[PDB]
Design a protein around this motif. Sequence first.
Motif, PDB file in Angstrom:
ATOM      1  N   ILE A 146      44.712  32.399  48.743  1.00 10.68           N
ATOM      2  CA  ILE A 146      43.844  32.293  49.912  1.00 10.68           C
ATOM      3  C   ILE A 146      42.579  31.527  49.551  1.00 10.68           C
ATOM      4  CG2 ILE A 146      42.339  33.650  51.437  1.00 10.68           C
ATOM      5  CD1 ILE A 146      44.693  35.722  51.485  1.00 10.68           C
ATOM      6  N   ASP A 175      48.118  32.193  57.435  1.00  7.14           N
ATOM      7  CA  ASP A 175      48.744  33.241  58.243  1.00  7.14           C
ATOM      8  C   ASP A 175      49.912  33.877  57.500  1.00  7.14           C
ATOM      9  OD1 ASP A 175      47.021  33.135  60.456  1.00  7.14           O
ATOM     10  OD2 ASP A 175      48.323  31.812  61.618  1.00  7.14           O
ATOM     11  N   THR A 178      48.667  36.140  54.811  1.00  9.27           N
ATOM     12  CA  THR A 178      48.244  37.373  55.471  1.00  9.27           C
ATOM     13  C   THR A 178      49.432  38.276  55.759  1.00  9.27           C
ATOM     14  OG1 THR A 178      46.316  36.325  56.474  1.00  9.27           O
ATOM     15  CG2 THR A 178      47.166  38.338  57.489  1.00  9.27           C
ATOM     16  N   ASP A 179      50.488  37.712  56.345  1.00  5.51           N
ATOM     17  CA  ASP A 179      51.698  38.483  56.595  1.00  5.51           C
ATOM     18  C   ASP A 179      52.237  39.069  55.305  1.00  5.51           C
ATOM     19  OD1 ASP A 179      51.486  37.642  59.230  1.00  5.51           O
ATOM     20  OD2 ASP A 179      53.015  36.078  59.008  1.00  5.51           O
ATOM     21  N   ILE A 182      50.190  42.062  54.168  1.00  4.28           N
ATOM     22  CA  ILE A 182      50.495  43.223  54.991  1.00  4.28           C
ATOM     23  C   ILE A 182      51.862  43.780  54.626  1.00  4.28           C
ATOM     24  CG2 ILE A 182      51.108  43.953  57.325  1.00  4.28           C
ATOM     25  CD1 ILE A 182      48.120  43.930  56.819  1.00  4.28           C
ATOM     26  N   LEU A 192      49.640  51.962  59.248  1.00  7.83           N
ATOM     27  CA  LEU A 192      49.156  50.741  59.892  1.00  7.83           C
ATOM     28  C   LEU A 192      47.640  50.635  59.797  1.00  7.83           C
ATOM     29  CD1 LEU A 192      51.339  50.374  63.140  1.00  7.83           C
ATOM     30  CD2 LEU A 192      51.241  48.821  61.153  1.00  7.83           C
ATOM     31  N   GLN A 193      46.949  51.733  60.072  1.00  9.63           N
ATOM     32  CA  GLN A 193      45.499  51.747  59.961  1.00  9.63           C
ATOM     33  C   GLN A 193      45.073  51.381  58.556  1.00  9.63           C
ATOM     34  OE1 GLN A 193      43.700  55.588  60.645  1.00  9.63           O
ATOM     35  NE2 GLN A 193      41.656  54.724  61.048  1.00  9.63           N
ATOM     36  N   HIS A 196      45.462  47.532  57.801  1.00 11.98           N
ATOM     37  CA  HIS A 196      44.427  46.663  58.349  1.00 11.98           C
ATOM     38  C   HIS A 196      43.126  46.848  57.592  1.00 11.98           C
ATOM     39  CE1 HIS A 196      46.863  47.076  62.331  1.00 11.98           C
ATOM     40  NE2 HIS A 196      47.396  46.169  61.530  1.00 11.98           N
ATOM     41  N   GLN A 197      42.782  48.101  57.273  1.00 12.91           N
ATOM     42  CA  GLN A 197      41.556  48.382  56.529  1.00 12.91           C
ATOM     43  C   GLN A 197      41.579  47.768  55.131  1.00 12.91           C
ATOM     44  OE1 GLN A 197      41.018  52.619  56.714  1.00 12.91           O
ATOM     45  NE2 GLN A 197      40.307  52.588  58.848  1.00 12.91           N
ATOM     46  N   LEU A 199      43.449  45.199  54.115  1.00 14.76           N
ATOM     47  CA  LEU A 199      43.415  43.746  54.263  1.00 14.76           C
ATOM     48  C   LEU A 199      41.983  43.265  54.396  1.00 14.76           C
ATOM     49  CD1 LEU A 199      44.788  40.992  54.679  1.00 14.76           C
ATOM     50  CD2 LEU A 199      44.974  41.535  57.080  1.00 14.76           C
ATOM     51  N   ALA A 200      41.196  43.936  55.260  1.00 16.94           N
ATOM     52  CA  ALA A 200      39.799  43.550  55.491  1.00 16.94           C
ATOM     53  C   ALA A 200      38.962  43.730  54.231  1.00 16.94           C
ATOM     54  CB  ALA A 200      39.210  44.369  56.644  1.00 16.94           C
ATOM     55  N   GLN A 201      39.135  44.854  53.534  1.00 16.37           N
ATOM     56  CA  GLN A 201      38.380  45.082  52.311  1.00 16.37           C
ATOM     57  C   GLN A 201      38.652  43.988  51.296  1.00 16.37           C
ATOM     58  OE1 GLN A 201      39.580  48.968  51.034  1.00 16.37           O
ATOM     59  NE2 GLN A 201      38.866  49.994  52.940  1.00 16.37           N
ATOM     60  N   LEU A 203      39.704  40.836  51.872  1.00 14.76           N
ATOM     61  CA  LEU A 203      39.175  39.553  52.326  1.00 14.76           C
ATOM     62  C   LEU A 203      37.649  39.531  52.306  1.00 14.76           C
ATOM     63  CD1 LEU A 203      41.671  38.744  55.216  1.00 14.76           C
ATOM     64  CD2 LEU A 203      41.730  38.031  52.867  1.00 14.76           C
TER      65      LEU A 203
END
Lengths: 236, 217
Positions: A146, A175, A178-179, A182, A192-193, A196-197, A199-201, A203
């Motif tokens: 990335i 993209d 990212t996939d 995940i 799922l929660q 996403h959490q 992934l954000a941490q 990035l």
Amino acid sequence: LALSLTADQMVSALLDAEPPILYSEYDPTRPFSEASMMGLLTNLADRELVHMINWAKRVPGFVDLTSHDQVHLLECAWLEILMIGLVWRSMEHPGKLLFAPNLLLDRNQGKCVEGMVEIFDMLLATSSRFRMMNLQGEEFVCLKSIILLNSGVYTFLSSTLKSLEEKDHIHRVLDKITDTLIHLMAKAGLTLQQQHQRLAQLLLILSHIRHMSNKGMEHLYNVVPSYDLLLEMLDA
Amino acid sequence: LALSLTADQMVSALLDAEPPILYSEYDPTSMMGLLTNLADRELVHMINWAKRVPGFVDLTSHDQVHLLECAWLEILMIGLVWRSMEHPGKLLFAPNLLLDRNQGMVEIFDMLLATSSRFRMMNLQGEEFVCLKSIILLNSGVYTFLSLEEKDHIHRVLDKITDTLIHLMAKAGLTLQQQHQRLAQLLLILSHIRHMSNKGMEHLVPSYDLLLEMLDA
Ligand code: NI
């Protein structure tokens, strides 16, 4: 071909592209001077850069770009990529940075060259953050990719139809990575929660790596690899 | 209470804390003078905006100042990119101060334009914008020590803003795959904003003690 890869094919391709671990120049005079330790670090980085380009050319989607766009991605990302590698190598050595297997440095050696302890402290905090998160090797190679594709993309020209094709292409590959991140997290068992959490941490840590890379160039203010050098290694 | 907020409450709180769009001092009827004076007045609103970001005032004053010290220019810049988004090729510093490339260091203003263009292509929504600005505030200084309890709290608030962004996109009708792809795209732009801030900073002001007096008051 890159956009056709499933998540597991992306991971395998990124794992197989990983560059080698290099050693520092053997038996330098210890203790260091400012000049001698900058010298060892420069020589290590210059040797790592060659393998960086070989790695870059194996990152799915990278070779589809023009040589000019490839060189600009490397120009913007090279220090961040070296830095994230250093942070990953250092995770299991708390309080120290593992530049090479034979060059393990603690905070107070960072004080040696003016301006560098501050970046050492940031690098060590990133290594602790990655240890905190239990960063996985498969996640690390996605992050490094990335960094390569994202850091320089905002600098494409958009002058021409092609430039939009180049930059739409990079965003499609980003993209897919990212996939892939995940997918690895769902396969670990995260909800799922939690996916996403996490992934954000991960990035968000990339903005800190960008900061440290910027900070380091600024204290530096001709050891950065030139366009022409990066281009020649790309064509070799 | 910040950790107990729903997604709709987080967005409401951030939308309600949004500072006004300020005007340049020009009176007719110097470029830096104008930009400095503008930034000077935006900073006063920024401090009071930061106190209203959920979870921010739970931190020690020292940690609050450290986060503002690290993020203030990123915050000004993301506000400029948001304002300029519907003015391709131009930067709307204020409604009465719209500048094009020629009027611009030029490098940063090429980077700011590219960011505005990216937000336009992604149809960035006002609710997503306020979320991203709060992430900049909480995240830019956290890895520079802003101790362990403070850092954990900040990460729980950041996780709440992540949940908020995902909720917004689920309500806008995005599939799960689109939700995570868009989350990543938005957060990767924050790396570029950090880079524009660093570059602007090193081409060149509020000190630690200035921000704390401003935030004491
Ligand atoms: Ni160039």
